[PDB]
Amino acid sequence: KDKIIDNAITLFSEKGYDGTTLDDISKSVNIKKASLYYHYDNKEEIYRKSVENCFNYFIDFLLRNHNYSIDGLYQFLFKFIFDVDERYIKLYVQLSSAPEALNSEIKHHLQEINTTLHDELIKYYDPTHIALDKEDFINLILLFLETWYFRASFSQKFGIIEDSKNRFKDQVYSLLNVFLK
Amino acid sequence: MKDKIIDNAITLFSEKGYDGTTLDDISKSVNIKKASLYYHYDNKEEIYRKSVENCFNYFIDFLLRDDNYSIDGLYQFLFKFIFDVDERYIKLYVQLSSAPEALNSEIKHHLQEINTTLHDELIKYYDPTHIALDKEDFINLILLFLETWYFRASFSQKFGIIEDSKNRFKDQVYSLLNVFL
Numbered sequence A: 001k002d003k004i005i006d007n008a009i010t011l012f013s014e015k016g017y018d019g020t021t022l023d024d025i026s027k028s029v030n031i032k033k034a035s036l037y038y039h040y041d042n043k044e045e046i047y048r049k050s051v052e053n054c055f056n057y058f059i060d061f062l063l064r065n066h067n068y069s070i071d072g073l074y075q076f077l078f079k080f081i082f083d084v085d086e087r088y089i090k091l092y093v094q095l096s097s098a099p100e101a102l103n104s105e106i107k108h109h110l111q112e113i114n115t116t117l118h119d120e121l122i123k124y125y126d127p128t129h130i131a132l133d134k135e136d137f138i139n140l141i142l143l144f145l146e147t148w149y150f151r152a153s154f155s156q157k158f159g160i161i162e163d164s165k166n167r168f169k170d171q172v173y174s175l176l177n178v179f180l181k
Numbered sequence B: 001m002k003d004k005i006i007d008n009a010i011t012l013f014s015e016k017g018y019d020g021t022t023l024d025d026i027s028k029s030v031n032i033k034k035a036s037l038y039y040h041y042d043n044k045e046e047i048y049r050k051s052v053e054n055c056f057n058y059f060i061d062f063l064l065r066d067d068n069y070s071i072d073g074l075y076q077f078l079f080k081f082i083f084d085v086d087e088r089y090i091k092l093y094v095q096l097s098s099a100p101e102a103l104n105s106e107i108k109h110h111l112q113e114i115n116t117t118l119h120d121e122l123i124k125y126y127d128p129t130h131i132a133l134d135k136e137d138f139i140n141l142i143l144l145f146l147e148t149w150y151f152r153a154s155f156s157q158k159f160g161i162i163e164d165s166k167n168r169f170k171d172q173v174y175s176l177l178n179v180f181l
Helices: A002-015 A022-028 A033-037 A043-063 A070-083 A086-097 A100-122 A134-158 A161-179 B002-016 B023-030 B034-040 B044-064 B071-084 B087-098 B101-125 B135-159 B162-180
Strands: none
Touching (some): A002 A043, A022 A033, A043 A070, A043 A100, A070 A134, A070 A161, A086 A134, A086 B087, A086 B135, A100 A134, A100 B135, A134 A161, A134 B087, A134 B101, A134 B162, A161 B135, B002 B023, B002 B034, B002 B044, B002 B087, B023 B034, B023 B044, B044 B087, B071 B101, B071 B135, B071 B162, B101 B135, B135 B162
């Protein structure tokens, strides 16, 4: 079942909600399509559980700090760009065309990650090392994060992701460095 | 009739995405029988292709065509991008990352064209006299604002209130542009 959702996230990320079939999902974990009907009523429910998994993945990733120094902020950005799994970024970006029935549930997940992010980011704010007010600091970092979702999904589809990760990291450090004390 | 088919297709694709839109959805939106549709396009992929070419032309035209390149003109360029760009187009653009593989090459070339056009136009606002930042940092800051807006507008048109997203983002951009310049 963890196997089913694991594989579904991969398929939904590549084919989309509408382009993925129950046959695909069942063929992927090697079970009969009929067997999916015990735990799920339809493809929409499997999609709903994949999105939930996606949000939990980002929240845990954001909260994972094995250092809230400036060195830790640079590391935090480095991990987001290089280590966030491409399939989760693609699934996240495709939420903008999700079935309307899920609108309110996704909206609830979006509020939640917006909150966790804001609370985590403020912990890196240190006026002694950053020449920016708290508000602009947080908004700046959110621009970096959101723009990576955009760049990563295009680069992976139309370009060379390894090249984009290195380039984007250099660009973001360069802008942030403008305010480093 | 082609213009009406494309305009309505753009609305449908932006809301439902490519795989979720059907020719019946399209013919119904434009009040024609499917038969009139095949007279103009051979299949859904060709209609999507034309909708995408229309989209790139819309953004290029927006860039090439107030001819004030002062800092004040840069704030106005950003305000217009945020307030005057059709949300359907932004969403169609962000969704190119899930386009059908047969359009990969065409879309990759369109992206190369727009990135070059954007770069050539943004450089016109770069005046070392009035701008402290190095040219690359300046161009990169503006691209972060534009790309973050595609991301935020695509989600706000679906899950939130777009007027409020436009206002809030513009305020954030003005604030950062202020401390950076």
